[model samples]
Every structure is written in C-alpha cells, then in structure tokens.
Target: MKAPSYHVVRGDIATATEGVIINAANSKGQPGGGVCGALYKKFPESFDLQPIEVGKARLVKGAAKHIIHAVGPNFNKVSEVEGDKQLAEAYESIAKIVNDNNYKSVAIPLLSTGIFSGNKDRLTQSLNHLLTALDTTDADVAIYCRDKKWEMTLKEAVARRE
Candidate 1:
C-alpha cells in the first residue's frame, strides 16, 4: 500500500504530469467543458470513451495511465444535498479507481464548479468530503487549484475542520 498525502497546488489540471488527474464530466462523458474540455483537447487520443457512467472512471492515455472522469451531480439539476451526495460518491469512485488500478499519485481539481454552477459551499462540500474520505487511504491526493479563490476555498475547508 502507498502512503496517503493531499496537496493544494496552483495551475491547470491539464498540465498535470504525474499520476492520474480527474475530470468533471457528465454521464454522457463527451468530454465537454471545464477541465474536461481542456483535457479532451489536450489528449484527444485518450478520451475515446463514450458515456462514462456516474461513479465510474476510465483510464485514458497521455500523461498517465488513469484519468478518472467523475460525474458530479449538478447543483442546478438536483437539490443541494443530493448534489453533495453525488460528489461524495464520485470521490468514492475515484478512490476505488486509483486503488484498483494500483495508482500512487493523483491530482484532483475543484470538481463540478463549471457549468454545473457550483458556489463556495458546493466546492467546499465536494473537496471537504473528498478529503475526509481519503484521509485514511493509501494514495497521494493532490488537490490542484487554478485560482486563488479555489486555493482559499480548499484551505478554508481544511482549516475549518480543526
């Protein structure tokens, strides 16, 4: 088993080179928007799968073997609590993906904050729940933030736990 570590870094997940990075896509898994869109463009050869189911991941080809594309429930479509539960399940999905694939390192961005119309609480819920779930895991979790606001959001989420 690998060790567990979480990081909040700055920059785009598209530039992630080590381990598996996650994409926030829909159940259709067309590789549409947000980090998902960018990754689709960056690694067109890898995202050949269609309609990835919710709570499942696909191993793409490119920077690494696995790129867990998670389908977090859109807060705009579901109740806030339901959306939160979906995120938690997505995080859980990623854990199983990483562990089963024997992956050691991974980069996770603020999932579902794009057209999904997620606010601070939404991000906090997703990331905080991810952190809590992975707290005892055996893989390194890297929470990459593309902006200061995201950095602060994750920071506050972890800080508030203390």
Candidate 2:
C-alpha cells in the first residue's frame, strides 16, 4: 500500500483539482505576494480576490469552481503561542470550508512564511500539528511549495522525529 504522501510541484493552484485551493492570504484576502501572487498571475481572469475579514473568501469563475482564501497569522506581529494558535485555526477553518462545500481535495501553501518572516521551527511544528489534526478527515490535503529548497526543507522537517 502507498503510505500517506504529499507531492511537491510547481503549478497553478487554481487548476489543482475539482475542489478548492486554499490561498495563504492576509485578512483582506488580496492576492498580493507569494503563493497568492502566483495564483493571481497564473489564473488572472479565472480568479477573483474576494475581501474577507479574518476568515476565508470563496471566488468562482467559469470552469474553476472556487478558490478559498484562508487568512493565516501574520508572522510579523504574532507571538509564538499566538502563531501556533492561528496556524491551527487556519488549518481547521480551511478544512471545514472545503468539507462544507463538499470538496474532495484542497491545495495549501506553507503559511506564515514569505513576507511574514515566520520562525521556521514554530511554523513547521504548527504545520505538522495541523496535518495530524486533519489526518482522519475525508479531504485530500496537498501542501505545495514553489521550489526545491522549500520542498526539501518541508519534507525533511515533516519526516524528522521530535
């Protein structure tokens, strides 16, 4: 049997599958930079950056069902505990949104990195915890990275024993 796996690939998140693509968005849900920017750039006409306050935004255009924008903690201002809590909340929120919308698969990028300047260890821990929390859920989660360095680092960190 195949073990539980996460694939590292460079592609448009909007076209990942039939379900939703979770954008690592700010509270405003603007596709400004990082993965958000990529999504906006790749599928400009097909996606709309919906404004949301401390939550998720759903945008639909033609063939693409929806892009779910989930706001995560901004690493610049959050404390360690707050960061972890926010990460967990973001994961849970995204999962619920996808499940509620009857989506089978949802793609997510590494939150709290990029311009937010997240602490690597804490960010990894929070991500692992989020994965563990969602292990039993029906939604197929795909954690995506832009390049090889992030791909390798995330894979190694997730595989390491604490």
After superposing candidate 2, which stretches have Cα over 4 Å from the reference? Answer: 1-5, 10-15, 34-36, 42-50, 55-62, 118-123, 157-162
lDDT of 1 by residue, 1-162 (tens): 445776677887778865787877788665456344777777766565678765565666554335677787777778877777777787788777777777778888766766675444456566776886566468777787767877877776666753
**lDDT tens digits, residues 11-73, model 2?**
556557736676667775666574447677676654554565543345454354467676767
Model 1 poorest 10 in a row by lDDT = 57-66
Q: Estimate the overall C-alpha local distance difference test score of candidate 1.
A: 0.70
Kindly provide the TM-score of model 1 when superposed on the true structure, using C-alpha atoms: 0.82
Error of model 1, residue 65, in angstroms: 5.2
- TM-score of every prediction relative to native: 0.82, 0.73
Clashing residue pairs in candidate 1 are none
lDDT of each: 0.70, 0.61
Clashing residue pairs in all predictions, respectively, total 0, 0
